Symmetry: D3
Subunit: 156 residues, 6 copies
């Protein structure tokens, strides 16, 4: 399947997500990077969103709570081009029973090949890339072509 | 947490999904039950929906290909109250690598307690119930309250 | 592989299962549906079973505790035709470490295409279908034919 | 919870299972160790058992095909005390989609602390141990007590 | 792919691992089997290691804490031949969020076909096999040959 | 637990990994970014590394085949501080059965908070950041302290 060269916009649509024991960490990261982040459009799952607004006076579009459908809302937005950078701080050691599934989100982000930070150090590289504030070129694999060939083969 | 009651409408919004080797089975099921399904609003992932339009001339709202984000569109729509019945025929023996993930959709259908058929016989019971064509009462567990309080104790 | 038309009995063999935080919910559901349920034969995992007997004076065959083998006993019973309706209320948000695996049970129920309720609203549709108290027709996929063709190919 | 001691019998009840690409390996292992295995009671999933009967003239109790419920029959029998050794040769590289799930069987073997060989070399150590042909002592953790008390605090 | 006959050493390199609620159990097992275990070289994840040294005066090489990379250190050691017996007592009912993943470790042990105990009764058979203190023969599947044929096919 | 600061070096130790159907993509990416990658120390799983040596004459340290233990070698090296950037191009649609597990590597990269690219566009942001070629500060959560205290309360 084909690899296409696609141009991406200067102003980004950034989804901000954190597992519960990473919420204060995300808050702090956002707080040191306010100047750059305030040039882009920002979204968050419900509770992280409230925290940002409440502790920073930040302007963010709030989706539903991650475990109550907010994770699928943001995944759908990725697939519709309405989010194009994912920042997801997650708990690799003691995650809550309800803490949002990292897999499905990173998967749909990989399908659409968008920038993803799943470590805080990755987010620091992302936010300081010249590509953050500029137009840039990305390679989109033609997964639709691949998928349909396979489906037709099975179905006949 | 509290359990509270919601009355659901007579006319349903029904999501139809099939794993690749179950596509023809779901087509045969829809074809045999058209009189009843034609009273309702029908939705489907990309390829299953085209197949229904082509083979049956059925008026179905087509979403993206399931593996390319249609699954998450449908999950988002369940959480938003835009879908209130899920019919998903799946492959329990030989699923393809890309076959739509059953767990995440049944998870979100269960959070919002909507009727779900993940076997063909379950589907025959659903469509024959008098509640298919009438309003009925569902119990909605107050997951937002519990969740909010747990998140609080962690972030605190 | 072939799809066979198979007739199923008027009197059902119903397995009743609940994750810990759904046990009181299952109790209440059973309590509003006693009249219909008392026409069929009923089974439960060990602790749910005891609860039903203790809080309702219900007659139910008790298997082992779900996490100590009761889940496999009921799956085996499905595969031997000794259970033919599954009612499983489960915890989509805060499940216990030991709470019975939903996947394996829904899988073997799909192999044998029996009616399954994994939401309480699904159970209300099931119990009110005319098929609940009548003989009905079901489609059994010939999974055995499919499996053996595949196995022989690998083994030579 | 309490740990208590159970004496196990000299004559074992042994479940033999192999993933499709390991079927010939298990046949060669059984064939090389017949003198010892012939002293014990032998059980197998559907296709592995037929193969042993055909190729070696071995008296093996055949269960259902593993992917069609034989795995759960065997898990139920472990929990019931009807199987007390599990020999399972599995494919760690290229398993088929239907290949029997390793986790659920080792889970239940561990709950009931029975000897388990999930590598061929482990099997050579098991069958050569003097405990293969004698009675021995096993520690059984009182999982029912702990479980019961946890379920109680939740339902309460 | 080929099955090769490979000779293994009399003196073993044993990795000792326990989930948190099995740590005291592993301690006790080691304490009844000190005489045999002291003939071989012993390794453990960080915290289990400390416990053994602290409660038994045992000489063991300590890797990092299992959840902080110790599990991958031991898996790498298996793949490099530096560990050739795995003893892993694990929690089948109430595992901690951080408790070491059993799957990846048993998988790499199966790739390299080494003796594995994942039940305490299995460990008692292992430690009493004459093969424990002797040279023995093992069958190594040529997984490398298989893998490369597959990779070349995809990549072209 | 405490969050503390570590300064990372100008010269990076970079692990390069690709699922089989992404091997050619990673080769094209490395080829386009050679000027920058040649300033750093490069590591790769077995087959990806040979391909880079063959096609680009690149000096890469080759580890074992990913599915035969190279993945765990790399995870061990991350935990040991021997790798401080992970570039992993993976197949979100049609992964092979043996394709390297994404979760375990991103888990350990997150424990030790190193920069991670699991999409090609993330990789273009990483390599263009001024932090690629300078020293930078990372936050290391004190996971060993928390873990140690939790293990203690359990064993106690
Ligand atoms: Cl992080
Ligand atoms: Cl079905
Ligand atoms: Cl429900
Ligand atoms: Cl093996
Ligand atoms: Cl055990
Ligand atoms: Cl990508």
């Amino acid at each position: 399947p084909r690899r296409y060269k696609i141009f991406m916009d200067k102003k980004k649509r950034i989804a901000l997500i954190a597992h519960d024991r990473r919420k204060r960490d995300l808050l702090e990261w956002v707080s040191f990077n306010l100047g750059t982040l305030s040039k882009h459009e920002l979204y968050a799952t419900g509770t992280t969103g409230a925290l940002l607004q409440e502790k920073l006076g930040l302007k963010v579009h709030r989706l539903k709570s991650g475990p109550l459908g907010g994770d699928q809302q943001i995944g759908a937005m990725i697939a519709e081009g309405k989010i194009d950078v994912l920042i997801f701080f997650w708990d690799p050691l003691e995650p809550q029973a309800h803490d949002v599934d990292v897999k499905a989100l990173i998967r749909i982000a990989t399908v659409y090949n968008i920038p993803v930070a799943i470590t805080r150090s990755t987010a620091d590289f992302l936010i300081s890339s010249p590509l953050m504030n500029d137009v840039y070129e990305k390679i989109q694999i033609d997964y639709e072509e691949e998928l349909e060939r396979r489906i037709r083969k099975v179905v006949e």
